[PDB]
């Protein structure tokens, strides 16, 4: 899709293997903010957003949090607290064409900046002058959408680049996109180290009389630590008691 009308893809209710994506050497730029790429195989997230577009090869540095320029300022602005990954690879031999390709357009003129994660497909004529444009091209009334015009023979600074942005929501919620890790039978009344949906800990899992609401998942104490969990496979509630300890 064009950079000014980028599509958004939903990923949920499946198991994803980020190892097969990371090991590929085709990608030229691969930057993950907030999460280490090699550890994505263990965490389980609640939802994945995928965004895809094509930009100029030299100007691929602009798609990053807290950046200023043309596309970031006017077409696609990333949030300042981004927690996700950005992948960008050369696509000269797939999107460029001899004699000029005009299937891709990019916005240039707008009155105000763009809020993060907002897509605009407005086609109104820019009004750079006091006179009304009346939907007629002319003085101070230009078409806001022009094409890049990719060609195979230009330098590195003009080849098209394909960019895909993956974003996760790290909010505590019922998780549905887990990594490929096999489950293990659970043991009660013994000091074990547990991993529930990516959250790790140590302690003893015991039976509980706590009445969670059907939508209610985790319980916390004063110190923000976890106190009771619900097993994802079997809808039971387990209290977590720290292992015995003491000075000698």
């Amino acid at each position, epitope marked *: 899709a064009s950079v000014y009308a980028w599509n958004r893809k939903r990923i949920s209710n499946c198991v994803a293997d980020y190892s097969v994506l990371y090991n590929s050497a085709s990608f030229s730029t691969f930057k993950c903010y907030g999460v280490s790429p090699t550890k994505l195989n263990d965490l389980c997230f609640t939802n994945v957003y995928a965004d895809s577009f094509v930009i100029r090869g030299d100007e691929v540095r602009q798609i990053a949090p807290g950046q200023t320029g043309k596309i970031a300022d006017y077409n696609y602005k990333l949030p300042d607290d981004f927690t996700g990954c950005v992948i960008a690879w*050369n696509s*000269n*031999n*797939l*999107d*460029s*064409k*001899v004699g000029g*390709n005009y*299937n891709y357009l990019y916005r240039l003129f707008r009155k105000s900046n763009l809020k993060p994660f907002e897509r605009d497909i407005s086609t109104e004529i820019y009004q750079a002058g006091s006179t009304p444009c009346n939907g007629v091209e002319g003085f101070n009334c230009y078409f806001p959408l022009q094409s890049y015009g990719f060609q*195979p*023979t230009n330098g590195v600074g003009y080849q098209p680049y394909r960019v895909v942005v993956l974003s996760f929501e790290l909010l505590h919620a019922p998780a549905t996109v887990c990594g490929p890790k096999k489950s293990t039978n659970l043991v009660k009344n013994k000091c074990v180290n547990f991993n529930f949906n990516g959250l790790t800990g140590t302690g003893v899992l015991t039976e509980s009389n706590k009445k969670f609401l059907p939508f209610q998942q985790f319980g916390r104490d004063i110190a923000d630590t976890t106190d009771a969990v619900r097993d994802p496979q079997t809808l039971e509630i387990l209290d977590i008691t720290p292992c015995s300890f003491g000075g000698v």
Partner: antibody
Amino acid sequence: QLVQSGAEVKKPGESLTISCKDSGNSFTIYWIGWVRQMPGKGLEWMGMIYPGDSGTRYSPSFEGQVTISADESINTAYLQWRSLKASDTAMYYCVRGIAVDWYFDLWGRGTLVTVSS
Amino acid sequence: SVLTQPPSVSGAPGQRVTISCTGSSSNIGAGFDVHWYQQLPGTAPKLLIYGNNNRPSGVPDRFSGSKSATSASLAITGLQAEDEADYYCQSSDSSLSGLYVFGTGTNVIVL
């Protein structure tokens, strides 16, 4: 005009290599590739290579079975077989390919390969 | 994901003939052009129409074609005796699996 080799006959199990040469001075601009046609039926895409950055694309029905390479100095594409089978006898065309619009433009006369046991 | 195509048709010299190539939303949908190719008996083939609206050099003007959403068709006005050949309709696909997919093929008979 793209030149090629002749028609050859070989035993199954050996390795056969065909080559297609382009005389033009615009080799590393467009794509090159291969196509097969089984006698009596229509053709099917095989593989396609961009020599500018050695990009290689294959078809799912013809993955691993065959291998295709190319060189930017001699300006020639090689197609090599692992193990010839009795049912792979067909007519093979080296083809020049254009991008975006995804159509072929002009092809050579092709080559004929026969395998018998 | 091969494209559907009727086996063959017949025609008479001096009259218009028409052929069709039909597919699905995955192949011809989402705005994907269809190109046409020839097959002379025992001869290296040649292009007919690319981009569904343009036309190359060296081809007679008696050929035309257009697409209607899911289907596409071409017309020949005044077929002659040399039109004894095989015709192929080629399109693309959404994924990189179907970059180049061809139809089964169609043939015509004069008189």
